[PDB]
Amino acid sequence: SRKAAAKESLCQAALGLILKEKAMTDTFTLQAHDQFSPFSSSSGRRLNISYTRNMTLKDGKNNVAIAVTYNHDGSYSMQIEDKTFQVLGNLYSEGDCTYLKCSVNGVASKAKLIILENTIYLFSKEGSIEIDIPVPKYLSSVGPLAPMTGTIEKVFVKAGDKVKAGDSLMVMIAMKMEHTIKSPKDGTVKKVFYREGAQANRHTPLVEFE
Amino acid sequence: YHGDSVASLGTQPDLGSALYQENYKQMKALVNQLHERVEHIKLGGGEKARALHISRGKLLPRERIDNLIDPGSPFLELSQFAGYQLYDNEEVPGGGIITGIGRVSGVECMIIANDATVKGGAYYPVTVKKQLRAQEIAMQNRLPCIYLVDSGGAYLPRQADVFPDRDHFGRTFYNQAIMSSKNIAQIAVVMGSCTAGGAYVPAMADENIIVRKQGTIFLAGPPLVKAATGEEVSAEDLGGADLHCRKSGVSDHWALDDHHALHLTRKVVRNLNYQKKLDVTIEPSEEPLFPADELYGIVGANLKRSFDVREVIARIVDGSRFTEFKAFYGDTLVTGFARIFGYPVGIVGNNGVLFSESAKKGTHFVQLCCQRNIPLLFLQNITGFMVGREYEAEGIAKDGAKMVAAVACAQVPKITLIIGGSYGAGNYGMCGRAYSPRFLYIWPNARISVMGGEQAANVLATITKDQRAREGKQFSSADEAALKEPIIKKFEEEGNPYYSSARVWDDGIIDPADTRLVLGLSFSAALNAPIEKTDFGIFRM
Amino acid sequence: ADENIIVRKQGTIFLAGPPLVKAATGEEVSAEDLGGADLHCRKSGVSDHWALDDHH
Amino acid sequence: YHGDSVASLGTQPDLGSALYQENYKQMKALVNQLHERVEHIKLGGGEKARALHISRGKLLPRERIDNLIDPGSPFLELSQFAGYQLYDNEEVPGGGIITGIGRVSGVECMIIANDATVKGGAYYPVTVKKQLRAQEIAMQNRLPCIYLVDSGGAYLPRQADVFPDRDHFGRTFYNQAIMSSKNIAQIAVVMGSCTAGGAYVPAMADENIIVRKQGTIFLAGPPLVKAATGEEVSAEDLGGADLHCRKSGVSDHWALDDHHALHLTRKVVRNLNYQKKLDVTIEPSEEPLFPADELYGIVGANLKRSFDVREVIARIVDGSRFTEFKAFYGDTLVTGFARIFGYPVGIVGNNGVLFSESAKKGTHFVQLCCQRNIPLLFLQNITGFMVGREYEAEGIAKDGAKMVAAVACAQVPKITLIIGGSYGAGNYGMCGRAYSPRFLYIWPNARISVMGGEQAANVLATITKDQRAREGKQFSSADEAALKEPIIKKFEEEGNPYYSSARVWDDGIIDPADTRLVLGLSFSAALNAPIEKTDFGIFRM
Numbered sequence A: 001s002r003k004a005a006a007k008e009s010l011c012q013a014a015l016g017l018i019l020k021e022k023a024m025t026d027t028f029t030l031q032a033h034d035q036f037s038p039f040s041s042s043s044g045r046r047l048n049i050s051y052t053r054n055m056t057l058k059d060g061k062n063n064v065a066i067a068v069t070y071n072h073d074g075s076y077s078m079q080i081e082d083k084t085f086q087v088l089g090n091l092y093s094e095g096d097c098t099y100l101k102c103s104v105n106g107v108a109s110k111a112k113l114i115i116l117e118n119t120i121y122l123f124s125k126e127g128s129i130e131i132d133i134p135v136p137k138y139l140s141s142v143g144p145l146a147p148m149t150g151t152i153e154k155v156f157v158k159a160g161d162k163v164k165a166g167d168s169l170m171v172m173i174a175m176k177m178e179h180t181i182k183s184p185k186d187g188t189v190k191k192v193f194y195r196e197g198a199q200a201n202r203h204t205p206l207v208e209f210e
Numbered sequence B, D: 001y002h003g004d005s006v007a008s009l010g011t012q013p014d015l016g017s018a019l020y021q022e023n024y025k026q027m028k029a030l031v032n033q034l035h036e037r038v039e040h041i042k043l044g045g046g047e048k049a050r051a052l053h054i055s056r057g058k059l060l061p062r063e064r065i066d067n068l069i070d071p072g073s074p075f076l077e078l079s080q081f082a083g084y085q086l087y088d089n090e091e092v093p094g095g096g097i098i099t100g101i102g103r104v105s106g107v108e109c110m111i112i113a114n115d116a117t118v119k120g121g122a123y124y125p126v127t128v129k130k131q132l133r134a135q136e137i138a139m140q141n142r143l144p145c146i147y148l149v150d151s152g153g154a155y156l157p158r159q160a161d162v163f164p165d166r167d168h169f170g171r172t173f174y175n176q177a178i179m180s181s182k183n184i185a186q187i188a189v190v191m192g193s194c195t196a197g198g199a200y201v202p203a204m205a206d207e208n209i210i211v212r213k214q215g216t217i218f219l220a221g222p223p224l225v226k227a228a229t230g231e232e233v234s235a236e237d238l239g240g241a242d243l244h245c246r247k248s249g250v251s252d253h254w255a256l257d258d259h260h261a262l263h264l265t266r267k268v269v270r271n272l273n274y275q276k277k278l279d280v281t282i283e284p285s286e287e288p289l290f291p292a293d294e295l296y297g298i299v300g301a302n303l304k305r306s307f308d309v310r311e312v313i314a315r316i317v318d319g320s321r322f323t324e325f326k327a328f329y330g331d332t333l334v335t336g337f338a339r340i341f342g343y344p345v346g347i348v349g350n351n352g353v354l355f356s357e358s359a360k361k362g363t364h365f366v367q368l369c370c371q372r373n374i375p376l377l378f379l380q381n382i383t384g385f386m387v388g389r390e391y392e393a394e395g396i397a398k399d400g401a402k403m404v405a406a407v408a409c410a411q412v413p414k415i416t417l418i419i420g421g422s423y424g425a426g427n428y429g430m431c432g433r434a435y436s437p438r439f440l441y442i443w444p445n446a447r448i449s450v451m452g453g454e455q456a457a458n459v460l461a462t463i464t465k466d467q468r469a470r471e472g473k474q475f476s477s478a479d480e481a482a483l484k485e486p487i488i489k490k491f492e493e494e495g496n497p498y499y500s501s502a503r504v505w506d507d508g509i510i511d512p513a514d515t516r517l518v519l520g521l522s523f524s525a526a527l528n529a530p531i532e533k534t535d536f537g538i539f540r541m
Numbered sequence C: 001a002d003e004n005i006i007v008r009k010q011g012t013i014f015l016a017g018p019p020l021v022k023a024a025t026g027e028e029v030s031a032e033d034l035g036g037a038d039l040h041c042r043k044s045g046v047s048d049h050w051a052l053d054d055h056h
């Protein structure tokens, strides 16, 4: 079965993500007119205070919160649950592969860093660990009223009918087109408020359910 | 930074639903018919005139254009259907002229070629109209003009419709004199026989090329000096290449044959000292996430059946990414920011009738785009302007005039695409032909009238019942049938896409796949001119 | 237009008249209360000056 | 060419001398105290209000700023000490608002966040002052403004000091209307409850984001309509996100929660069509040759003991290279050309009192820098203007007015740093707060008054002895002690760095190491506006 990641492995995943964001910043700068300028160094240097970034990584099924403090000397202090790790490192290339060079509490290591959509892959000589980046809700999310003052074409339902969602309820022709009223609702039509052929008015009720 | 993820538009349609299959079959039929009609237009005046044209050693005009532009480069041809069934028994293919935006020596140019296989290069009224439209494209977008003159002069029994008015033949030379006063280069290659109105085209151009023993320039030809002064002259020594290149000085470069003229033209364009400078921001281009025959399945051919315009924007923009603006207020207008080939586009699309809130949403959006210098793309699918009483009480015609006033005053490049109907003053709110868009293409299912027919027949009948009610008698079923026949027939005839592009009311009927490419081509040509600051009028609040 | 004058009980402004809303939406309205001078000068705000008759 | 070698400034100090060790201990104490005070300011209104703020599902405002700017990007926060011990028993941390220059979507922006944990987002007078200072930074440097509105309206018992004047609350909306008329983008994210003066902040902005079931905009809230019209309404249906996003049309984008609002804000900034273009020359940046805790050892905390300003310039500029200008004429002013992060800087630093020759040297230098479009950095350490008789005979006040007139008329970016005292009209000669520098930081050892304590007490005593000498009696030791107590106490209290940045008289107390970084950040922000030609007045020769 899959085993839980060690806190040191979560530090490596967090560091790889931070350095990948830096890489994106660096390749933006290489295309800029304002070259050599500050703001391009992803140092997190606040004035008179320190910056702590709170990120969450998903280890299998469970979420872990990692508080990453940006230090003045370029190191990171990553507190995972309670334990603080001194995390340093950088990226380097060998041919077409990107490697993440780490030092966590004086312990040096090297792993291949591959980030594909949401999943952080760390390939080392002791195993392979997959850490997922959570996806926020706003990137994963994707009775009736008469629209215009028009004449009624056809009434589909009666007093006492049971319909479904996405079902043709009434049809009206307005000026040049054809707009069918369809039901988002659930329940029973007790009321057909407009007789066939009448002129409905915008923002108006056609069918009522109890 | 530009690394953080976003969402995209569009959903995959039901490929098995009968709505999709019927829509696909109808729009495929329209597109196949469009293809076979333009392949017949591609021949020109028939194989007899083509044989007599190549028997004198000339190229055909599309061969001239293929040898003039860069190798492998695309060619955006404008108004391929001008003159289509327009004159009663005369066939004028392509208008009798070929206009297009091409790429010569790494510069995007406007190319105007006299197709001499049709009527000997005579100038019909639609020929003058199509040429003047090409010239105002080149003056708006600051593109050099290359005229490949092989003319025949102005037709005689249509001479009124060609000669005196403001936008008649003489405007052509006006447009050469003004463009060259703005440093927009004119180049004329004389490959034919310029007779007395065509003779002003190379003489008003900065640089000429004339072909040895083939091109002739004279203000009065041999039958014209016969009828005017009474004189017999031979044509090649009245106005041939040797006299003009050596004695009179009308021509500047001298070519052996047509290949030499086109090679010299590419040299002349390279010595123009032109460098294209962009002022918008550019990003890496990216293809969408959906195909474009899905647009055949989604749009169909039924204009009484509505669809969603977000499906179209999902299939023409970069990566199908779209930042929607005011998505819940006035939701019969879809406004937002996208990218086409790396260019920033503000898109305005119709999704229903125009209420008051939709027009206010559009006015806010057009002011935003003009403040930031972002080009506009209008996607017209209109049916009306919300007729009613509680609507006129609010100020609906107080609110559509703000939309009209903002679209008129806007100084960014605007491009219209008519993907559906386009009726009434709604057509003016969404940048119709009168509002100077840079380009205006249509899809083969479009309709454009002042109404839809039924409405015109009903208004005329009720107005004449009111009018006759000073005395008052009815002819009920007779009046009904006899007004519902010739008005529905007329409006459906004149609302056709081929009727409207037989005139020069638009820049082309395009295939719904090709849409994305065509927009990109048009947008890059429209970026040759620097975008100027917009001043608006008085917004009536 | 920047400034309007509309005449009392004579001038009417509407984007769709009575036979036009008849043929388009199917509605009967009277013209002087669909788009007359009183509605535009007092409620909708299309008109800026209000005249009694043509000399005014 | 740029290959030929040059010399550099600076010498390594005696790390063992008692002067260095005492200076290091004093400036280390000042910097540690500055750090602990700003860490207490970082919490805001205490842990009770933070718990009730996150119990409603909101972020804390510094979390909002961290999630809005680019990841890892620095943040230049302005006026962290506004409101510090300013009101008598009320604690207003940070002013009640958080302003700073950050980097959003690769664009450097000004961010103004209502810190709603302190006084429910009420607007104290220092809150209005600090916000207006941020807005004039953004109008001078042409930076887009992002307002993160979580307001509470204008405080009541201080209402005079907030409401009517020119630089009172209403100026805020003036600055939004003028900046947006110059194409400087305004973006408002409504995360709170905008009550009747805050309600004009999103309605004056080009693009809005409002959060579902959390952000509310109304010109009159529920107790306000109670006291004004007598009406009970619920707040989330009086002015919630659904009404404004769907019916009234005040809002343009609709967010689910705060993370969605910040993600949408980064999208909106990316669609601004902005590209930063530089007009100065840039060279490869290089770090200096000396550390920056040496500045603790060199400056110290004794303002009666002078030092050399060339030691500071040696530790803030590129490679410690410095081209000195007129090094032997008027040597109490050090002028020259250096580079900070590759940007060309003309530096003017004080080394003593201002004579006449020093002011003429400075006027020549400022004309040189404005002719070449080089930004200016003033390093104030002033004690006076050389009082004397043989000095007024020459025209000392004829020569300091030339310095004042040249610094006032200069149209390049000017940045001041007060590293020591700053007294009298000398403060005006070296670009004080009245002379519109872009930024003005201070070090924790600075002092600023009109004439320092002793001098004011002596002048008041001698002028009251002269004044009373119309009759004339003395109270010698009594008058001496009783005027030397409350005047030295007052001047030393009001000359403090925390006194001056408790108001918005400067943009921050900075640590002498951080100096180099802060200058670089400020200078790059100051290069977003194109440098205009300078016109001078009349130099009185």
Ligand SMILES: CC(=O)SCCNC(=O)CCNC(=O)[C@H](O)C(C)(C)COP(=O)(O)OP(=O)(O)OC[C@H]1O[C@@H](n2cnc3c(N)ncnc32)[C@H](O)[C@@H]1OP(=O)(O)O
Binding pocket: B119, B120, B121, B122, B151, B152, B153, B154, B155, B156, B193, B195, B196, B197, B221, B223, B224
């Ligand atoms: C006077 C004016 O400015 S208005 C007309 C211009 N003046 C003229 O010279 C009119 C006479 N035509 C000419 O200009 C020339 O002699 C040309 C271009 C027609 C000579 O062309 P050619 O290569 O010899 O071909 P041809 O003369 O047979 O013309 C082909 C056809 O086009 C017609 N045509 C050509 N030019 C014109 C014209 N300007 N007006 C009317 N019809 C024309 C001809 O009637 C001929 O008729 P067809 O198509 O029914 O057979």
Ligand SMILES: CC(=O)SCCNC(=O)CCNC(=O)[C@H](O)C(C)(C)COP(=O)(O)OP(=O)(O)OC[C@H]1O[C@@H](n2cnc3c(N)ncnc32)[C@H](O)[C@@H]1OP(=O)(O)O
Binding pocket: D119, D120, D121, D122, D151, D152, D153, D154, D155, D156, D157, D192, D193, D195, D196, D197, D221, D224
């Ligand atoms: C003068 C004008 O421009 S009209 C101002 C209209 N006044 C208001 O709308 C403010 C009153 N209402 C609120 O503050 C709303 O509840 C919110 C959403 C803005 C704040 O949420 P809450 O935290 O529930 O408000 P709460 O009642 O806790 O206010 C916290 C403190 O802010 C104070 N406060 C808020 N606005 C003001 C104001 N304009 N003047 C004086 N005090 C204020 C409250 O009295 C309260 O007292 P405290 O200073 O002892 O803490």
Ligand SMILES: *C(=O)CCCC[C@@H]1SC[C@@H]2NC(=O)N[C@@H]21
Binding pocket: A175, A176, B382, B383, B384, B385, B386, B387, B422, B423, B424, B425, B426, B450, B451, B452, B455, C015, C016, C020, C024
């Ligand atoms: C077909 O287009 C339906 C009827 C047209 C609507 C009419 S035509 C003139 C009025 N102007 C407008 O925008 N709508 C009205």
Ligand SMILES: *C(=O)CCCC[C@@H]1SC[C@@H]2NC(=O)N[C@@H]21
Binding pocket: D382, D383, D384, D385, D386, D387, D422, D423, D424, D425, D426, D450, D451, D452, D455
């Ligand atoms: C402390 O700053 C010493 C005395 C101040 C010098 C006085 S104050 C007003 C005069 N102006 C000036 O530049 N110096 C004089």
